[PDB]
């Protein structure tokens, strides 16, 4: 369904928010200068979950596969279509006379 | 002495309108001055192929003898506007069907006179005598009720019933499409 597309959007948004959080946390260190050297569990969990949902949505957004066997889409092609030959059309048929000229 | 019903003429016009750009053909069945009680179409476009014609004729004979009719006429409408003479296919098919009953004569839908209301009788009836096929008198009366045929053909064409019409070729495409096409028959009954 189309909602899949919407899903991926929020995923990116989630990732974007993670970035902001990470940036802020970096400022934290740039003002604390302590031996933490570790991201908050909340931000990494949020980033990983956003990655998972965004990838799952993207896989759907990629599209639908197509079968290799050439007789798949040609199965429904009745003989009433392949014979038309659009380049070799002739307009000397009963259609013109029968219909309004 | 060839006589066909008004429903035969409306079926003629219906099949002509369904595939205006492609030459068509088919049969007309009657009970044993013969009166063609019913008709049936078959194929369009390419018509010189034998196997479809043979399988068709066999199915027509089976269906008719199961329900007491017998095939007694052949119709063919050509593709070209300025063409009104039978081709090899029509001549041989008419000769073969006429082998059973001598009263069988060919009919061809002259597409030059094909109009909305069918002001003049489009069909031309050809007889086989002296081993040659030649047309009858054009001034002869062909349909049983000419004003009725005119009005029913006009109503059917203006009702866009030609798209719904199904011939033998659509049955070949899918059996779910009824080749006996009783739908046009009930429409004829309702109109009459
Ligand atoms: C993925 C995008 C990364 C997320 C943004 C992280 C970030 O770096 O966040 C901090 C900045 C706030 O920078 P500031 O204006 O407060 O200081 C500027 C000082 N001054 C005005 C003197 C120049 O906000 C921002 O989005 C950074 C703005 C540029 C990066 C966004 C472009 C990518 C879309």
UniProtKB/Swiss-Prot annotation, chain A:
Component of the ER membrane protein complex (EMC). Keywords: Endoplasmic reticulum, Endosome, Golgi apparatus, Magnesium, Membrane, Phosphoprotein, Transmembrane, Transmembrane helix, Transport. It is found in: Endoplasmic reticulum membrane; Golgi apparatus membrane; Early endosome membrane. The chain crosses the membrane at residues 2-20, 42-61. The keyword Magnesium applies. The chain holds residues 3 to 103 of 131 of the full protein. The keyword Protease does not apply. Part of the endoplasmic reticulum membrane protein complex (EMC) that enables the energy-independent insertion into endoplasmic reticulum membranes of newly synthesized membrane proteins. Preferentially accommodates proteins with transmembrane domains that are weakly hydrophobic or contain destabilizing features such as charged and aromatic residues. Involved in the cotranslational insertion of multi-pass membrane proteins in which stop-transfer membrane-anchor sequences become ER membrane spanning helices. It comes from the Eukaryota. GO terms for molecular function: cobalt ion transmembrane transporter activity; ferrous iron transmembrane transporter activity; inorganic cation transmembrane transporter activity; magnesium ion transmembrane transporter activity. GO terms for cellular component: early endosome; early endosome membrane; EMC complex; endoplasmic reticulum membrane; Golgi apparatus; Golgi membrane; membrane; plasma membrane. It is a multi-pass membrane protein. Belongs to the membrane magnesium transporter (TC 1.A.67) family. The gene is MMGT1. One of its GO terms (biological process) is protein insertion into ER membrane by stop-transfer membrane-anchor sequence. Residues 21-41 are lumenal. This is ER membrane protein complex subunit 5.
UniProtKB/Swiss-Prot annotation, chain B:
It comes from the Eukaryota. Expressed in liver, pancreas, heart, lung, kidney, brain, skeletal muscle, and placenta. Expression levels are highest in pancreas and moderate in heart, skeletal muscle, and placenta. InterPro entries: EMC8/9, MPN. GO terms for biological process: protein insertion into ER membrane by stop-transfer membrane-anchor sequence; tail-anchored membrane protein insertion into ER membrane. Keywords: Endoplasmic reticulum, Membrane. Residues 2-132 form the MPN domain. It is found in: Endoplasmic reticulum membrane. It is a peripheral membrane protein. One of its GO terms (cellular component) is Golgi apparatus. The keyword Coiled coil does not apply. Pfam families: UPF0172 (PF03665). The keyword NADP does not apply. Belongs to the EMC8/EMC9 family. Component of the ER membrane protein complex (EMC). EMC8 and EMC9 are mutually exclusive subunits of the EMC complex. Part of the endoplasmic reticulum membrane protein complex (EMC) that enables the energy-independent insertion into endoplasmic reticulum membranes of newly synthesized membrane proteins. Preferentially accommodates proteins with transmembrane domains that are weakly hydrophobic or contain destabilizing features such as charged and aromatic residues. Involved in the cotranslational insertion of multi-pass membrane proteins in which stop-transfer membrane-anchor sequences become ER membrane spanning helices. This is ER membrane protein complex subunit 8. It comes from Homo sapiens.
């Amino acid at each position: 369904p189309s909602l899949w597309k919407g899903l991926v959007g929020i995923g990116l948004f989630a990732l974007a928010h993670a970035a902001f959080s990470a940036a802020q946390h970096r400022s934290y260190m740039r003002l604390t200068e302590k031996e933490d050297e570790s991201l908050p569990i909340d931000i990494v969990l949020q980033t990983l979950l956003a990655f998972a949902v965004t990838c799952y949505g993207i896989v759907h957004i990629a599209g639908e596969f197509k079968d290799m066997d050439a007789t798949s889409e040609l199965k429904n092609k009745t003989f009433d279509t392949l014979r038309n030959h659009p380049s070799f059309y002739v307009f000397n048929h009963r259609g013109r006379v029968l219909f309004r000229p | 002495g060839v006589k066909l019903t008004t429903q035969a003429y409306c079926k003629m016009v219906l099949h002509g309108a369904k595939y205006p750009h492609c030459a068509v053909n088919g049969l007309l069945v009657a009970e044993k001055h013969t009166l063609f009680v019913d008709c049936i179409p078959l194929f369009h476009g390419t018509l010189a192929l034998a196997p479809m014609l043979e399988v068709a004729l066999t199915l027509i004979d089976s269906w008719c003898k199961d329900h007491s009719y017998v095939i007694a006429g052949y119709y063919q409408a050509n593709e070209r506007v300025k063409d009104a003479s039978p081709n090899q296919v029509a001549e041989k098919v008419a000769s073969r069907i006429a082998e059973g009953f001598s009263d069988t004569a060919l009919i061809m839908v002259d597409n030059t006179k094909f109009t909305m209301d069918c002001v003049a009788p489009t069909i031309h009836v050809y007889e086989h005598h002296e081993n040659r096929w030649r047309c009858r008198d054009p001034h002869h009366d062909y349909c049983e009720d000419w004003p009725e045929a005119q009005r029913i053909s006009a109503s059917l064409l203006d009702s866009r019933s030609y798209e719904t019409l199904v011939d033998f070729d659509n049955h070949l495409d899918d059996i779910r499409n009824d080749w006996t096409n009783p739908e046009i028959n009930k429409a004829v009954l309702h109109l009459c």
